[PDB]
Design a protein around this ligand. Structure first.
Ligand SMILES: *Cc1cc2c(cc1C)nc1c(=O)[nH]c(=O)nc-1n2C[C@H](O)[C@H](O)[C@H](O)COP(=O)(O)OP(=O)(O)OC[C@H]1O[C@@H](n2cnc3c(N)ncnc32)[C@H](O)[C@@H]1O
Ligand SMILES: [Cl-]
Length: 385
């Protein structure tokens, strides 16, 4: 009960998905987490997460986006927890002045994705509640939408445990001991060994990968989101208000329609405070920017959603220099798999990454093309310690 086929350190978004994929195949797995997933100390809380297919960060993410979407529909059918709502996703910005909008459109064209292209008042007409200038243009993806992130992790966990996966909670891994033919982790609750290791500690990857002789630039950011009292006749998912990710002059913002009257949810993507996951302040409102940055967007583009602040949440991104993920084998240990640096946009791919991680851990290879997430790519600035 202390040696396993595979050990996953960090059973959050990526780790729990990998655990489900491994258990599903009869592989004896141990998932270890410092807390009890899903929780509010990592990067997966706040209830909802956007999934987009036409991908503004890069058209090369489309295949993984589509596989992940199919896997989310499979999860929906396997659990009693709500997984996905097809709100559609709206992307807009000043015409010819948004690289994000442009790449989303190009990604759609290249993968033959279903989208609606509109501009100026056509946007305001279609979605009462949105007020953009006449020079703005947009691309709407009707078949993408919103995932209930905490539900996703809970379902994957329940399914994996039912299949035999063991989950050791409130147990912080403090060190690693890797050998040619096995792996070992040290915790205050005991040491555990296995044949393969998957490391997916989220924001903590920036602090602990050095324990694996890895020196990779990874910066954790404090990123808040606020839920606002809104005009339900305009912003409710029931009246088809969409999820959105947009780029305006001062940056990128993302939001969600109000679900069951929870209020419209908004986040500012471009800015966040550089922090350490062990000292970060998880209280919303301690920095003037928390609420002011959100209201400045709402007052200008979605005025009817600028009501009382119903709830605020504080979460973390873990950025790489090029803002692309790290999914690969440890350069010096083929029996160690690393999943890190999701840079604020990886939850939607967590179902697909779970699959990738499972394959890398069991075979050292994957049917997916993950070259752009290579741990040895130059733009990363990686090296040994
Ligand atoms: C924060 C945030 C992120 C975000 C977003 C909005 C906010 C405010 N909106 C998104 C969206 O609309 N669409 C999307 O695709 N992504 C969005 N994101 C990003 C996404 O949430 C993150 O990329 C994702 O959650 C990253 O997942 P990962 O699995 O890396 O991180 P985690 O879920 O935090 O899990 C890490 C786990 O590891 C554990 N841990 C940490 N250290 C240890 C040690 N030492 N020992 C054992 N376990 C450890 C944590 O407890 C955690 O469970
Ligand atoms: Cl992240």
């Amino acid at each position: 009960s202390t040696h396993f086929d595979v050990i996953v350190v960090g059973a959050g978004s990526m780790g729990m998905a990998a655990g489900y994929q491994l258990a599903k195949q009869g592989v004896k797995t141990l998932l270890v987490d410092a807390f009890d997933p899903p929780h509010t100390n990592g990067s997966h809380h706040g209830d909802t997460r956007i999934i987009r297919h036409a991908y503004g960060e890069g058209r090369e993410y489309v295949p993984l986006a589509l596989r992940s979407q199919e896997l989310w529909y499979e999860l929906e059918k396997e659990t009693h927890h709500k997984i996905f709502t097809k709100t559609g996703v709206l992307v807009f910005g000043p015409k010819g002045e948004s690289a994000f909008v442009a790449e989303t459109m190009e990604a759609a064209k290249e993968h033959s994705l279903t989208v609606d292209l509109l501009e100026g008042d056509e946007i305001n007409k279609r979605w009462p509640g949105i007020t953009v200038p006449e020079n703005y243009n947009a691309i709407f993806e009707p078949n993408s939408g919103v995932l209930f992130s905490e539900n996703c992790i809970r379902a994957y966990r329940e399914l994996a445990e039912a299949r035999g996966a063991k989950v050791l909670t409130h147990t912080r891994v403090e060190d690693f001991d890797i050998s040619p033919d096995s792996v070992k982790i040290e915790t205050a609750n005991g040491s555990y060994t296995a044949d393969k290791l998957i490391v997916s500690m989220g924001a903590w990857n920036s602090k602990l990968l050095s324990k694996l002789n890895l020196d990779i630039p990874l910066q954790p950011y404090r990123q808040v989101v606020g839920f606002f009292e809104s005009d339900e006749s305009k912003y409710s998912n029931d009246i088809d208000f969409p999820g959105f990710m947009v780029e305006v002059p001062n940056g990128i913002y993302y939001g969600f329609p109000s679900f069951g009257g929870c209020g419209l949810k908004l986040g500012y993507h471009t800015f966040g405070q550089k922090i350490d996951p062990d000292t970060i302040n998880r209280e919303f409102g301690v920095y003037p920017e928390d609420e002011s940055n959100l209201r400045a967007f709402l007052e200008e583009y979605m005025p009817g959603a600028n009501g009382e602040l119903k709830r605020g949440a504080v979460c973390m991104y873990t950025k790489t220099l090029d803002e692309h993920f790290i999914i690969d084998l440890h350069p010096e240990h083929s029996n160690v798999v690393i999943a890190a640096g999701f840079s604020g946009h990886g939850f939607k791919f967590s179902s697909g990454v779970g699959e990738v991680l499972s394959q890398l851990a069991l075979t050292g290879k994957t049917e997916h093309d993950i070259s752009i997430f290579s741990i040895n790519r130059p733009a990363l600035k990686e090296s040994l310690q």
